[PDB]
Amino acid sequence: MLKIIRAGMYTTVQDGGRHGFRQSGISHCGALDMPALRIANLLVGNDANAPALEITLGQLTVEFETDGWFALTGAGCEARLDDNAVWTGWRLPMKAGQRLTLKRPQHGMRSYLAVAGGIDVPPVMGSCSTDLKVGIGGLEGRLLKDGDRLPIGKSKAQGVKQLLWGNRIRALPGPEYHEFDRASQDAFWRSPWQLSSQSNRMGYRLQGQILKRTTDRELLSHGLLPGVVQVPHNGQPIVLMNDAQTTGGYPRIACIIEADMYHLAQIPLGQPIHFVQCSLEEALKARQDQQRYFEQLAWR
Amino acid sequence: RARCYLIGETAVVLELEPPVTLASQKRIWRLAQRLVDMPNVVEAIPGMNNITVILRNPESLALDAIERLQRWWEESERFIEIPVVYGGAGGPDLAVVAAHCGLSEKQVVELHSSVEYVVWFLGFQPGFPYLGSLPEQLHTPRLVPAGSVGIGGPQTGVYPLATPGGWQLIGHTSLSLFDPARDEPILLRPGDSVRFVPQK
């Protein structure tokens, strides 16, 4: 019921996440900007973790066959619906035979598109998130291409405020924070970090200063999670995202808090990234405030 | 000795001193069953003499996680046969691995099959086993098809997916380790005993 004309460069069906299987080497995946997908599904009336399309650098045209409602969140791509300009963060109505044309955005990176009822696709292991490395979920475990159709589910116009993005991200130090000299611990907070072209849905590679580690002791393979900043032998930090490895043997200098993970998703490939030294009470209160923020959206 | 460090604000990592042991990993397997059987633990990921426990209610359980996982650690309360088709197309580096070890192809496939391996933990890819302790004689320097058995120094295992690898491939398997539509999607679990069965 949702025909695609131009799919773009990195468009996939994303959900809340494929949880419960990190112990067996399966990445949870899901939307990089979890707050953007949740607001979109909330606006259309679906469950906050319902399946919605993730779009990287707009350039998407999708023709609608069934009547219902829709919404756009994430980076503003100046979406045009037939003969009108539609904007992000609204429960917009949709009729049959109308095209929605997103263009390349000037600010941001990833944009989300949710429809009433949700994208009915087979939930592979309690989730519809596309795993591009494994080849499962979404639509045959691959990027959407030109000519495909995604079947909409059966549903059964208040504008909501979106969350502002930025380049300052709160990170918590350690476990291996006390293995780097004083010039590397300071540089991690004071010095800016440029995003590299290698950065994708798995992990972001950061270009900056050479962080020197004092120890040369081998690290035993340990469980990982999104937001952990690893520093290999080259000295350039790697931020793990949703499709990252579950296990790794690299020294972890810092860990980005779940409340600020959504900011990484919108940062362009040429803009810097600043790290802010955080605290556990601040990291937990910030996590509550964002969980508490979706409960405010649930009362509309 | 054990150390308990917070990994971010949602997980706690219990580790052990560098000289690893099979007895310490046995308790980690026994604790990984206990941790996932309660509502407050979203995941319990074991590694090498260490376990990462992610929590669903970290705001209350965070500080408790450094006092609770240390105490549960002080208490510390299957057999699968995988059919491997050694050599030919499945194992092109079988000839090169036999040359370095100083033993023929039949000798390198006889002792590799004789060792009954145990799964320490799963990671990197869906259903990939970190099979511990490969005979000291079989050690040797470093897209790979799915279900490909290979060697990489002291580590040995199977490739459940098609990805670029650096291991020397000694054979291939028809039994899918990770199948997303079976019933039990992942074949191997941590603490299971893997055995490799030759065929030609």
Curated annotation (Swiss-Prot), chain A:
Pfam families listed in its UniProt record: CT_A_B
The EC number(s) this enzyme carries: 3.5.2.9
Highest taxon above the source species: Bacteria
Disulfide pattern: none
Catalysis: reaction(s): 5-oxo-L-proline + ATP + 2 H2O = L-glutamate + ADP + phosphate + H(+)
Keyword Nucleotide-binding appears in the UniProt entry: yes
Matches recorded under InterPro entries: 5-oxoprolinase_subunit, CT_A_B, Cyclophilin-like_dom_sf, PxpC
Knockout-associated phenotype: Deletion of the gene slows growth on minimal medium with ammonium as nitrogen source.
Record's keyword annotation contains Manganese: no
GO molecular function: 5-oxoprolinase (ATP-hydrolyzing) activity; ATP binding
SUPFAM superfamilies cross-referenced by the UniProt entry: Cyclophilin-like
UniProt-listed PANTHER family: 5-OXOPROLINASE SUBUNIT C
Family designation: Belongs to the PxpC family.
Role summary: Catalyzes the cleavage of 5-oxoproline to form L-glutamate coupled to the hydrolysis of ATP to ADP and inorganic phosphate.
Subunit-structure text: Forms a complex composed of PxpA, PxpB and PxpC.
Protein name, entry field: 5-oxoprolinase subunit C
Taxonomic source organism: Escherichia coli (strain K12)
Gene label: pxpC
From Swiss-Prot, chain B:
Enzyme Commission identifier(s): 3.5.2.9
UniProt keyword annotations, A-Z: ATP-binding, Hydrolase, Nucleotide-binding
InterPro entries with a match to the protein in the record: CT_C_D, Cyclophilin-like_dom_sf, PxpB
Annotated signal peptide: none
Catalytic activity: 5-oxo-L-proline + ATP + 2 H2O = L-glutamate + ADP + phosphate + H(+)
One Pfam family hit: CT_C_D
SUPFAM superfamilies, sorted: Cyclophilin-like, PH0987 N-terminal domain-like
Gene inactivation effect: Deletion of the gene slows growth on minimal medium with ammonium as nitrogen source.
Example GO molecular function: ATP binding
Residue stretches in coiled coil: none
Function: Catalyzes the cleavage of 5-oxoproline to form L-glutamate coupled to the hydrolysis of ATP to ADP and inorganic phosphate.
Family: Belongs to the PxpB family.
Subunit structure of this chain's protein: Forms a complex composed of PxpA, PxpB and PxpC.
Protein name per the record: 5-oxoprolinase subunit B
Lineage: Bacteria, Pseudomonadati, Pseudomonadota, Gammaproteobacteria, Enterobacterales
